[PDB]
mmCIF file of C-alpha atoms and ligand atoms in Angstrom:
data_model
loop_
_atom_site.group_PDB
_atom_site.id
_atom_site.type_symbol
_atom_site.label_atom_id
_atom_site.label_comp_id
_atom_site.label_asym_id
_atom_site.label_seq_id
_atom_site.Cartn_x
_atom_site.Cartn_y
_atom_site.Cartn_z
ATOM 1 C CA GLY A 1 -55.262 -71.774 92.236
ATOM 2 C CA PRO A 2 -51.986 -70.639 93.792
ATOM 3 C CA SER A 3 -51.937 -67.324 95.716
ATOM 4 C CA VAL A 4 -48.948 -65.209 96.823
ATOM 5 C CA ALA A 5 -48.210 -62.984 99.837
ATOM 6 C CA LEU A 6 -45.062 -60.847 100.081
ATOM 7 C CA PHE A 7 -43.895 -59.769 103.542
ATOM 8 C CA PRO A 8 -41.522 -57.011 104.536
ATOM 9 C CA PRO A 9 -38.573 -57.308 106.923
ATOM 10 C CA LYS A 10 -39.056 -56.444 110.570
ATOM 11 C CA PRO A 11 -38.189 -52.817 111.127
ATOM 12 C CA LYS A 12 -35.635 -53.721 113.806
ATOM 13 C CA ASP A 13 -33.838 -56.015 111.339
ATOM 14 C CA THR A 14 -33.549 -53.241 108.742
ATOM 15 C CA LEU A 15 -32.374 -50.678 111.285
ATOM 16 C CA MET A 16 -29.688 -52.660 113.085
ATOM 17 C CA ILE A 17 -26.847 -53.517 110.646
ATOM 18 C CA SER A 18 -25.895 -56.563 112.798
ATOM 19 C CA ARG A 19 -29.310 -58.164 112.238
ATOM 20 C CA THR A 20 -30.583 -59.895 109.130
ATOM 21 C CA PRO A 21 -33.547 -58.348 107.293
ATOM 22 C CA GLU A 22 -35.528 -60.689 105.054
ATOM 23 C CA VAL A 23 -38.300 -60.333 102.491
ATOM 24 C CA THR A 24 -40.500 -63.423 102.461
ATOM 25 C CA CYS A 25 -42.560 -64.616 99.494
ATOM 26 C CA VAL A 26 -45.213 -67.141 100.475
ATOM 27 C CA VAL A 27 -47.206 -69.293 98.061
ATOM 28 C CA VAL A 28 -50.231 -71.223 99.315
ATOM 29 C CA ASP A 29 -52.724 -73.572 97.625
ATOM 30 C CA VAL A 30 -50.005 -75.251 95.568
ATOM 31 C CA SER A 31 -51.759 -78.399 94.262
ATOM 32 C CA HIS A 32 -50.506 -81.982 94.095
ATOM 33 C CA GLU A 33 -51.062 -81.924 90.298
ATOM 34 C CA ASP A 34 -48.568 -79.084 89.771
ATOM 35 C CA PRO A 35 -46.403 -78.999 92.946
ATOM 36 C CA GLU A 36 -43.287 -77.350 91.472
ATOM 37 C CA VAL A 37 -42.851 -73.604 92.081
ATOM 38 C CA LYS A 38 -40.279 -71.245 90.532
ATOM 39 C CA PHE A 39 -39.433 -67.992 92.242
ATOM 40 C CA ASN A 40 -37.697 -65.097 90.472
ATOM 41 C CA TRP A 41 -36.635 -62.123 92.565
ATOM 42 C CA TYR A 42 -36.043 -58.605 91.301
ATOM 43 C CA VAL A 43 -34.664 -55.509 93.022
ATOM 44 C CA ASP A 44 -35.606 -52.381 91.071
ATOM 45 C CA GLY A 45 -36.100 -54.605 88.044
ATOM 46 C CA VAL A 46 -32.686 -56.303 88.248
ATOM 47 C CA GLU A 47 -32.841 -60.044 88.906
ATOM 48 C CA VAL A 48 -30.990 -61.256 91.999
ATOM 49 C CA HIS A 49 -30.003 -64.844 92.671
ATOM 50 C CA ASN A 50 -29.458 -65.250 96.424
ATOM 51 C CA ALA A 51 -32.954 -66.263 97.585
ATOM 52 C CA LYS A 52 -33.252 -69.483 99.628
ATOM 53 C CA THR A 53 -36.384 -71.495 98.886
ATOM 54 C CA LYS A 54 -37.491 -73.552 101.865
ATOM 55 C CA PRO A 55 -38.752 -77.099 101.360
ATOM 56 C CA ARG A 56 -42.421 -77.527 100.533
ATOM 57 C CA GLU A 57 -44.592 -77.802 103.607
ATOM 58 C CA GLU A 58 -47.707 -79.982 103.321
ATOM 59 C CA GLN A 59 -50.839 -78.550 104.959
ATOM 60 C CA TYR A 60 -53.724 -80.491 106.547
ATOM 61 C CA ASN A 61 -55.997 -79.595 103.576
ATOM 62 C CA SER A 62 -53.892 -81.374 100.892
ATOM 63 C CA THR A 63 -52.149 -78.289 99.504
ATOM 64 C CA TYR A 64 -48.546 -77.110 99.952
ATOM 65 C CA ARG A 65 -47.038 -73.925 101.340
ATOM 66 C CA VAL A 66 -43.832 -72.855 99.599
ATOM 67 C CA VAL A 67 -41.666 -70.048 100.954
ATOM 68 C CA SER A 68 -38.792 -68.160 99.360
ATOM 69 C CA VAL A 69 -36.693 -65.889 101.624
ATOM 70 C CA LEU A 70 -34.587 -63.093 100.167
ATOM 71 C CA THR A 71 -31.935 -61.575 102.429
ATOM 72 C CA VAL A 72 -31.843 -57.837 101.761
ATOM 73 C CA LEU A 73 -29.144 -55.252 102.177
ATOM 74 C CA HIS A 74 -30.178 -52.867 104.921
ATOM 75 C CA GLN A 75 -29.232 -49.876 102.747
ATOM 76 C CA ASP A 76 -31.205 -51.113 99.740
ATOM 77 C CA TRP A 77 -34.411 -51.447 101.829
ATOM 78 C CA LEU A 78 -33.904 -48.042 103.490
ATOM 79 C CA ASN A 79 -33.051 -46.413 100.094
ATOM 80 C CA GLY A 80 -36.518 -47.392 98.852
ATOM 81 C CA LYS A 81 -35.606 -50.148 96.420
ATOM 82 C CA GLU A 82 -38.565 -52.194 95.199
ATOM 83 C CA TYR A 83 -38.582 -55.917 95.856
ATOM 84 C CA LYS A 84 -40.473 -58.075 93.420
ATOM 85 C CA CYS A 85 -41.307 -61.743 93.839
ATOM 86 C CA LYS A 86 -42.324 -63.596 90.664
ATOM 87 C CA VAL A 87 -43.981 -66.982 91.290
ATOM 88 C CA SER A 88 -44.366 -69.482 88.415
ATOM 89 C CA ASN A 89 -46.517 -72.633 88.639
ATOM 90 C CA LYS A 90 -48.050 -74.815 85.878
ATOM 91 C CA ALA A 91 -51.589 -74.354 87.278
ATOM 92 C CA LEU A 92 -51.298 -70.573 86.737
ATOM 93 C CA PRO A 93 -52.168 -69.260 83.256
ATOM 94 C CA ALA A 94 -49.443 -66.658 83.858
ATOM 95 C CA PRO A 95 -46.889 -66.167 86.678
ATOM 96 C CA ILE A 96 -47.912 -64.067 89.724
ATOM 97 C CA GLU A 97 -45.885 -60.934 90.590
ATOM 98 C CA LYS A 98 -45.999 -58.980 93.832
ATOM 99 C CA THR A 99 -43.851 -55.965 94.696
ATOM 100 C CA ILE A 100 -43.109 -54.252 98.001
ATOM 101 C CA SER A 101 -40.992 -51.521 99.417
ATOM 102 C CA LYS A 102 -40.545 -49.319 102.432
ATOM 103 C CA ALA A 103 -43.125 -46.731 103.325
ATOM 104 C CA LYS A 104 -42.391 -43.535 101.340
ATOM 105 C CA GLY A 105 -41.806 -40.049 102.808
ATOM 106 C CA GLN A 106 -39.143 -37.633 104.059
ATOM 107 C CA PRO A 107 -37.661 -39.122 107.212
ATOM 108 C CA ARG A 108 -37.983 -37.109 110.411
ATOM 109 C CA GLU A 109 -35.928 -37.728 113.516
ATOM 110 C CA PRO A 110 -37.759 -38.959 116.601
ATOM 111 C CA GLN A 111 -37.480 -36.906 119.781
ATOM 112 C CA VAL A 112 -37.333 -39.334 122.724
ATOM 113 C CA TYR A 113 -38.239 -38.318 126.277
ATOM 114 C CA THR A 114 -38.606 -40.387 129.443
ATOM 115 C CA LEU A 115 -41.129 -39.312 132.090
ATOM 116 C CA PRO A 116 -41.118 -40.606 135.680
ATOM 117 C CA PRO A 117 -44.301 -41.751 137.532
ATOM 118 C CA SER A 118 -46.695 -39.113 138.741
ATOM 119 C CA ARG A 119 -46.419 -38.479 142.459
ATOM 120 C CA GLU A 120 -50.084 -39.575 142.633
ATOM 121 C CA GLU A 121 -49.184 -43.032 141.315
ATOM 122 C CA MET A 122 -46.770 -43.619 144.232
ATOM 123 C CA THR A 123 -49.726 -44.736 146.392
ATOM 124 C CA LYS A 124 -49.850 -47.852 144.184
ATOM 125 C CA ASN A 125 -47.731 -51.014 144.360
ATOM 126 C CA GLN A 126 -46.728 -50.765 140.708
ATOM 127 C CA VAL A 127 -45.754 -47.603 138.856
ATOM 128 C CA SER A 128 -45.591 -46.455 135.256
ATOM 129 C CA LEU A 129 -42.437 -45.175 133.532
ATOM 130 C CA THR A 130 -43.269 -43.392 130.296
ATOM 131 C CA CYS A 131 -41.315 -43.140 127.022
ATOM 132 C CA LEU A 132 -42.629 -40.420 124.654
ATOM 133 C CA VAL A 133 -41.368 -40.782 121.072
ATOM 134 C CA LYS A 134 -42.580 -37.941 118.873
ATOM 135 C CA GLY A 135 -42.055 -36.101 115.600
ATOM 136 C CA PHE A 136 -41.018 -39.177 113.604
ATOM 137 C CA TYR A 137 -41.563 -40.171 110.022
ATOM 138 C CA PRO A 138 -42.248 -42.695 108.527
ATOM 139 C CA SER A 139 -44.046 -44.773 111.115
ATOM 140 C CA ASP A 140 -41.650 -47.772 110.984
ATOM 141 C CA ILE A 141 -40.007 -47.852 114.397
ATOM 142 C CA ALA A 142 -38.988 -50.129 117.247
ATOM 143 C CA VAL A 143 -39.222 -49.098 120.885
ATOM 144 C CA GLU A 144 -38.102 -51.290 123.795
ATOM 145 C CA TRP A 145 -37.590 -50.931 127.560
ATOM 146 C CA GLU A 146 -34.598 -52.459 129.294
ATOM 147 C CA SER A 147 -32.897 -52.587 132.619
ATOM 148 C CA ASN A 148 -29.409 -53.976 133.418
ATOM 149 C CA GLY A 149 -28.940 -54.618 129.653
ATOM 150 C CA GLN A 150 -32.027 -56.865 129.470
ATOM 151 C CA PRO A 151 -35.591 -56.406 128.249
ATOM 152 C CA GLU A 152 -38.364 -55.677 130.771
ATOM 153 C CA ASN A 153 -41.355 -58.091 130.892
ATOM 154 C CA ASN A 154 -44.240 -55.672 131.627
ATOM 155 C CA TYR A 155 -44.371 -52.935 129.016
ATOM 156 C CA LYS A 156 -46.750 -52.042 126.272
ATOM 157 C CA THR A 157 -46.309 -49.652 123.395
ATOM 158 C CA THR A 158 -49.073 -47.767 121.639
ATOM 159 C CA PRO A 159 -49.305 -47.838 117.877
ATOM 160 C CA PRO A 160 -47.936 -44.759 116.074
ATOM 161 C CA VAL A 161 -50.477 -41.929 116.011
ATOM 162 C CA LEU A 162 -50.602 -39.202 113.352
ATOM 163 C CA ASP A 163 -49.869 -35.826 114.969
ATOM 164 C CA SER A 164 -51.183 -32.435 113.814
ATOM 165 C CA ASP A 165 -48.015 -31.649 111.817
ATOM 166 C CA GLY A 166 -48.181 -34.941 109.816
ATOM 167 C CA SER A 167 -45.441 -36.666 111.863
ATOM 168 C CA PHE A 168 -46.097 -39.662 114.171
ATOM 169 C CA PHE A 169 -45.843 -40.115 117.882
ATOM 170 C CA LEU A 170 -46.257 -42.984 120.301
ATOM 171 C CA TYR A 171 -45.807 -43.762 123.942
ATOM 172 C CA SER A 172 -44.385 -46.853 125.559
ATOM 173 C CA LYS A 173 -45.456 -47.579 129.131
ATOM 174 C CA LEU A 174 -43.258 -49.640 131.434
ATOM 175 C CA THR A 175 -44.822 -51.011 134.609
ATOM 176 C CA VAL A 176 -42.506 -51.916 137.471
ATOM 177 C CA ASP A 177 -42.771 -52.794 141.131
ATOM 178 C CA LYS A 178 -42.650 -49.523 143.076
ATOM 179 C CA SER A 179 -39.806 -50.870 145.232
ATOM 180 C CA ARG A 180 -37.567 -51.315 142.165
ATOM 181 C CA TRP A 181 -38.147 -47.668 141.241
ATOM 182 C CA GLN A 182 -37.559 -46.550 144.839
ATOM 183 C CA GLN A 183 -34.338 -48.571 145.028
ATOM 184 C CA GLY A 184 -32.814 -46.419 142.231
ATOM 185 C CA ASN A 185 -32.693 -49.047 139.470
ATOM 186 C CA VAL A 186 -32.016 -47.462 136.058
ATOM 187 C CA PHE A 187 -34.532 -48.106 133.265
ATOM 188 C CA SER A 188 -33.826 -47.340 129.633
ATOM 189 C CA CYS A 189 -36.000 -46.740 126.598
ATOM 190 C CA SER A 190 -34.237 -47.705 123.371
ATOM 191 C CA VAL A 191 -35.595 -46.398 120.091
ATOM 192 C CA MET A 192 -34.628 -47.570 116.611
ATOM 193 C CA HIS A 193 -35.587 -45.473 113.583
ATOM 194 C CA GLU A 194 -34.035 -44.692 110.224
ATOM 195 C CA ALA A 195 -33.730 -40.931 110.948
ATOM 196 C CA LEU A 196 -31.674 -41.450 114.144
ATOM 197 C CA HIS A 197 -27.936 -41.221 114.110
ATOM 198 C CA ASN A 198 -26.750 -44.895 114.030
ATOM 199 C CA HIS A 199 -30.503 -45.724 113.772
ATOM 200 C CA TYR A 200 -30.532 -45.936 117.560
ATOM 201 C CA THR A 201 -30.846 -43.863 120.673
ATOM 202 C CA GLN A 202 -31.394 -44.707 124.323
ATOM 203 C CA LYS A 203 -32.792 -42.540 127.116
ATOM 204 C CA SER A 204 -32.560 -43.591 130.779
ATOM 205 C CA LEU A 205 -34.653 -42.756 133.866
ATOM 206 C CA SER A 206 -33.973 -43.400 137.570
ATOM 207 C CA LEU A 207 -35.338 -41.938 140.833
HETATM 208 C C1 LIG B 301 -55.397 -74.676 103.004
HETATM 209 O O1 LIG B 301 -54.679 -74.413 104.198
HETATM 210 C C2 LIG B 301 -53.725 -73.374 104.089
HETATM 211 C C3 LIG B 301 -52.793 -73.392 105.309
HETATM 212 O O2 LIG B 301 -53.223 -72.565 106.395
HETATM 213 C C4 LIG B 301 -54.104 -73.238 107.340
HETATM 214 O O3 LIG B 301 -53.664 -74.542 107.713
HETATM 215 C C5 LIG B 301 -54.679 -75.266 108.403
HETATM 216 C C6 LIG B 301 -54.223 -76.703 108.620
HETATM 217 C C7 LIG B 301 -54.984 -74.577 109.727
HETATM 218 O O4 LIG B 301 -53.831 -74.634 110.577
HETATM 219 C C8 LIG B 301 -55.383 -73.123 109.507
HETATM 220 O O5 LIG B 301 -55.443 -72.449 110.769
HETATM 221 C C9 LIG B 301 -54.392 -72.411 108.590
HETATM 222 O O6 LIG B 301 -54.922 -71.135 108.210
HETATM 223 C C10 LIG B 301 -54.422 -72.029 103.848
HETATM 224 O O7 LIG B 301 -53.401 -71.043 103.745
HETATM 225 C C11 LIG B 301 -53.846 -69.689 103.960
HETATM 226 O O8 LIG B 301 -54.288 -69.136 102.742
HETATM 227 C C12 LIG B 301 -54.814 -67.827 102.874
HETATM 228 C C13 LIG B 301 -55.457 -67.401 101.554
HETATM 229 O O9 LIG B 301 -54.487 -67.404 100.529
HETATM 230 C C14 LIG B 301 -53.700 -66.879 103.324
HETATM 231 O O10 LIG B 301 -54.249 -65.589 103.486
HETATM 232 C C15 LIG B 301 -53.257 -64.549 103.410
HETATM 233 O O11 LIG B 301 -52.893 -64.118 104.723
HETATM 234 C C16 LIG B 301 -51.882 -63.103 104.700
HETATM 235 C C17 LIG B 301 -51.355 -62.889 106.114
HETATM 236 O O12 LIG B 301 -50.588 -64.058 106.441
HETATM 237 C C18 LIG B 301 -49.747 -63.869 107.597
HETATM 238 O O13 LIG B 301 -50.469 -63.776 108.815
HETATM 239 C C19 LIG B 301 -51.254 -64.918 109.130
HETATM 240 C C20 LIG B 301 -51.928 -64.697 110.479
HETATM 241 O O14 LIG B 301 -52.679 -63.509 110.430
HETATM 242 C C21 LIG B 301 -50.408 -66.196 109.169
HETATM 243 O O15 LIG B 301 -51.254 -67.319 109.304
HETATM 244 C C22 LIG B 301 -49.551 -66.329 107.909
HETATM 245 O O16 LIG B 301 -48.685 -67.437 108.004
HETATM 246 C C23 LIG B 301 -48.762 -65.039 107.688
HETATM 247 O O17 LIG B 301 -47.860 -64.854 108.767
HETATM 248 C C24 LIG B 301 -46.729 -64.019 108.420
HETATM 249 O O18 LIG B 301 -45.675 -64.789 107.871
HETATM 250 C C25 LIG B 301 -44.610 -63.974 107.416
HETATM 251 C C26 LIG B 301 -43.719 -64.768 106.462
HETATM 252 O O19 LIG B 301 -43.278 -65.959 107.072
HETATM 253 C C27 LIG B 301 -43.892 -63.427 108.651
HETATM 254 O O20 LIG B 301 -42.734 -62.694 108.296
HETATM 255 C C28 LIG B 301 -44.875 -62.548 109.437
HETATM 256 O O21 LIG B 301 -44.320 -62.173 110.685
HETATM 257 C C29 LIG B 301 -46.233 -63.242 109.649
HETATM 258 N N1 LIG B 301 -47.220 -62.251 110.062
HETATM 259 C C30 LIG B 301 -48.121 -62.480 111.017
HETATM 260 C C31 LIG B 301 -49.060 -61.350 111.330
HETATM 261 O O22 LIG B 301 -48.209 -63.548 111.624
HETATM 262 C C32 LIG B 301 -52.454 -61.849 104.039
HETATM 263 O O23 LIG B 301 -51.500 -60.784 104.051
HETATM 264 C C33 LIG B 301 -52.836 -62.191 102.597
HETATM 265 O O24 LIG B 301 -53.447 -61.059 101.957
HETATM 266 C C34 LIG B 301 -52.558 -60.426 101.003
HETATM 267 O O25 LIG B 301 -52.614 -61.005 99.712
HETATM 268 C C35 LIG B 301 -53.915 -61.009 99.124
HETATM 269 C C36 LIG B 301 -53.830 -61.594 97.717
HETATM 270 O O26 LIG B 301 -53.141 -62.824 97.770
HETATM 271 C C37 LIG B 301 -54.553 -59.611 99.090
HETATM 272 O O27 LIG B 301 -55.926 -59.737 98.791
HETATM 273 C C38 LIG B 301 -54.391 -58.865 100.418
HETATM 274 O O28 LIG B 301 -54.775 -57.515 100.285
HETATM 275 C C39 LIG B 301 -52.940 -58.955 100.881
HETATM 276 O O29 LIG B 301 -52.095 -58.306 99.945
HETATM 277 C C40 LIG B 301 -53.797 -63.379 102.582
HETATM 278 O O30 LIG B 301 -55.053 -62.946 103.113
HETATM 279 C C41 LIG B 301 -53.055 -67.366 104.623
HETATM 280 O O31 LIG B 301 -51.872 -66.647 104.900
HETATM 281 C C42 LIG B 301 -52.688 -68.844 104.504
HETATM 282 N N2 LIG B 301 -52.166 -69.327 105.778
HETATM 283 C C43 LIG B 301 -50.889 -69.689 105.944
HETATM 284 C C44 LIG B 301 -50.496 -70.160 107.316
HETATM 285 O O32 LIG B 301 -50.042 -69.650 105.045
HETATM 286 C C45 LIG B 301 -55.242 -72.154 102.560
HETATM 287 O O33 LIG B 301 -56.057 -71.023 102.325
HETATM 288 C C46 LIG B 301 -56.124 -73.408 102.538
HETATM 289 N N3 LIG B 301 -56.610 -73.596 101.179
HETATM 290 C C47 LIG B 301 -57.787 -74.144 100.870
HETATM 291 C C48 LIG B 301 -58.109 -74.259 99.404
HETATM 292 O O34 LIG B 301 -58.589 -74.549 101.711
HETATM 293 CL CL1 CL B 302 -26.294 -53.204 115.152
#
């Protein structure tokens, strides 16, 4: 029968007030016999009525996928409100409920440091600029490298790692042509996290 998956907003969308965070309720294996699907949404038990249900989407295996998207208030998500999707369908003996919310725990402010390439790496044609982000909680975070107000195309960020004090850390490594570093171009590591002032900080690094 029908099955439901409930997906959280992207951290960056919850952290930047200009962006639009969404909770997404997805129903799959909706049958042709009982194709109609009702979604009820609740926020800490109180029904809300602003969800947009997308049109049914027919799969290659003769079932439908039906999606309801609930726009959330950034502050509600960050204040730990519970989002419940209730999915009714005539093939279900009772409606399916799923609930989600933000990871729990006292927030802790990330410390953000940029580290230049080792002198030993300067023998190479590409070099590594390092962004250390440590002491944060919970693990929900976004970390991005930019130059001239635009994202860099060769960086990779480690997952959050539990540190010995129960906070998280990660590193993001930016690789650039050595000549760009030598020319004095400025590179910036932007970090978004709920325990930062304005949910944002940026640290820059140049030769
Ligand atoms: C008939 O076909 C259906 C359509 O899918 C297939 O189409 C065919 C034509 C091929 O193209 C094939 O490749 C496709 O798979 C089948 O639908 C599938 O059903 C299964 C079983 O119900 C679903 O499994 C769930 O998967 C969840 C994760 O889903 C996300 O990630 C997937 C990639 O890893 C991706 O495919 C999904 O679309 C979805 O993507 C996420 O979308 C959200 C919302 O839009 C977005 O915000 C995210 O960024 C995005 N994330 C990522 C990483 O891409 C699991 O979480 C889920 O498990 C949860 O619920 C369980 C209980 O329900 C529970 O046990 C778990 O613990 C957990 O809570 C579950 O495993 C699968 O998603 C679904 N595929 C799609 C595309 O919807 C169908 O099964 C099949 N039916 C039959 C009878 O044959
Ligand atoms: Cl913003």
